[PDB]
């Protein structure tokens, strides 16, 4: 749905994820996934001060 490859911010992704999980997912949960597989997602920070993740 995005015409550009810039990933959306985490503060949008987590609410969308939380509804699907039937359980609230927070920032610290993402770091658990990164520990298991380092190359799972790109974790570059947005200049707005919002965390981002991408394929």
């Amino acid at each position: 749905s995005r015409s550009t490859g810039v990933p959306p911010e985490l503060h949008v992704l987590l609410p969308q994820i939380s509804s699907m999980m039937k359980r609230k997912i927070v920032q610290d949960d993402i770091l658990k996934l990164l520990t298991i597989w380092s190359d799972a997602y790109v974790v570059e920070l947005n200049s707005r001060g919002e965390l981002t993740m991408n394929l």
Partner: protein, 433 residues
């Protein structure tokens, strides 16, 4: 075919509520009724091509949503916080002291605002009539005393708040309106302010100034919790389950302390009976109250003075919230919503004696002194506010402590509305309560 309108509490200032047309297909009809809050999934497209193109120059179309599926939610991590505070010491006092942090005193209003936010438990006996759970508050006082600012605070804190004014509203603008529809060619009805506030709160500022025809609609709204209309050949009834908070002014702009409430306002007595809490605020001068009030206000203005950065600002705002209120406000908004949605506290028959005996004692004093006869609706009001007090603690059963505070609020309002000669006699007779 259905229209969807923005959330009442989220419209930005200066704009009318944005809305879209929605297309519903077979097996998805009658899924919702006017006043419902729903979430729908569908396709967003333009479909007014055809006759509009040649109808006029620079022709235009409209956007619609083809409703594929419509739906009408908490997590345990949040309940980890709600349950903790629910059993803390003085939970009721933390709630009341957090209502309108920058307003001094008026604690009998703040407790009335708090109870009206949480509300009671509606009941519908099959084959009999229903019972409302909404708490009705009337704020009558002299100019000043921030009666209007309270309704502005209720607007932001409550979930679904609809704000109205006595003179700025109309009979059509409250009950319903009529629109044409070319698709089916029969008249369609669009709801007013009372229909919007269904399962919400309806605020009527300056309640006295509206005409009796406008005021008659409000009375039947609180009594029946529904809107009945027969206009343009449409006869139907809509759900209007809303709580009312009203601010008014006495005759001549000053309250006559030597006359009853029933003789200080043009609001007729049958309409006064629809309220649960009747607050009568006086503004009488005294250096004791004036130094306290002024030093609160002069600090309120120096506080609200304008002047990971977002996190820093939220932390600083939280610090100021703590400095004036015991509970952070956005947490309280969540806290109230969870209590309203989840908790439905129930009565214990063990407290039947505590309720009936006080009522008979209150009735006995009514004929003894005073002109206002105690009515069953007062007892109905006591149970409702008793349920609301239990709903504050997130306890599924009514306790004796909640009933004591419930008795205190209703008796105090009834006593304070009496004339001065009768007022002093009743205060001594109900020193226990």
């Amino acid at each position: 075919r259905v229209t969807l309108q923005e959330a009442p509490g989220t419209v930005p200032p200066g704009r009318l509520p944005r809305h879209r047309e929605v297309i519903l297909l077979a097996d998805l009809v009658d899924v919702s009724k006017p006043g419902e809050e729903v979430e729908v999934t569908g396709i967003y497209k333009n479909n007014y091509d055809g006759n509009l193109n040649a109808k006029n120059g620079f022709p235009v179309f409209a956007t619609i949503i083809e409703a594929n599926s419509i739906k009408r939610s908490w997590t345990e991590e949040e309940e980890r916080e709600f349950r903790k505070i629910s059993r803390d010491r003085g939970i009721i006092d933390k709630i009341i002291s957090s209502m309108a942090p920058s307003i001094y005193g008026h604690r009998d209003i703040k407790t009335a605002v708090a109870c009206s936010l949480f509300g009671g438990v509606p009941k519908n006996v099959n084959g009999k009539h229903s019972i409302r759970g909404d708490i009705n508050v009337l704020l009558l006082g002299d100019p000043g005393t921030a009666k209007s600012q309270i309704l502005k605070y209720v607007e932001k804190t409550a979930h679904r708040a609809v704000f109205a004014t006595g003179q700025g509203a109309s009979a059509v603008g409250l009950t319903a309106s009529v629109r044409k529809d070319p698709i089916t060619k029969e008249w369609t009805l669009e709801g007013g302010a009372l229909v919007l506030a269904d399962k919400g709160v309806c605020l009527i500022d300056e309640f006295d100034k509206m005409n009796d025809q406008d005021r008659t609609s409000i009375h039947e709204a609180m009594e029946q919790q529904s809107i009945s209309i027969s206009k343009a050949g449409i006869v139907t009834t809509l759900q209007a389950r809303c709580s009312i908070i009203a601010a008014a002014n006495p005759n001549g702009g000053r309250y006559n302390s030597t006359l009853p409430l029933a003789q200080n306002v043009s609001l007729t007595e049958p309409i006064l009976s629809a309220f649960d809490i009747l607050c009568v605020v006086r503004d009488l001068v005294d250096e004791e109250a004036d130094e306290r009030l002024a030093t609160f206000v002069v600090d309120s203005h120096v506080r609200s003075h304008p002047e990971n950065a977002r996190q820093r600002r939220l932390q600083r705002q939280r610090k100021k919230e703590e400095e004036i209120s015991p509970i952070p406000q956005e947490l309280l908004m969540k806290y109230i919503h969870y209590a309203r949605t989840k908790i439905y506290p129930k009565l214990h028959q063990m407290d039947m004696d505590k309720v009936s005996r006080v009522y008979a004692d209150l009735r006995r004093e009514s004929i003894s002194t005073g002109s206002f006869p105690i009515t069953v609706r007062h007892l109905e009001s006591i149970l409702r506010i008793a349920e609301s007090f239990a709903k504050m603690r997130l306890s599924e059963f009514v306790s004796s402590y909640d009933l004591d505070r419930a008795i205190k609020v209703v008796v105090d309002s009834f006593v304070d509305a009496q004339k001065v000669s009768v007022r002093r006699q009743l205060r001594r007779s109900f020193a226990i309560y």
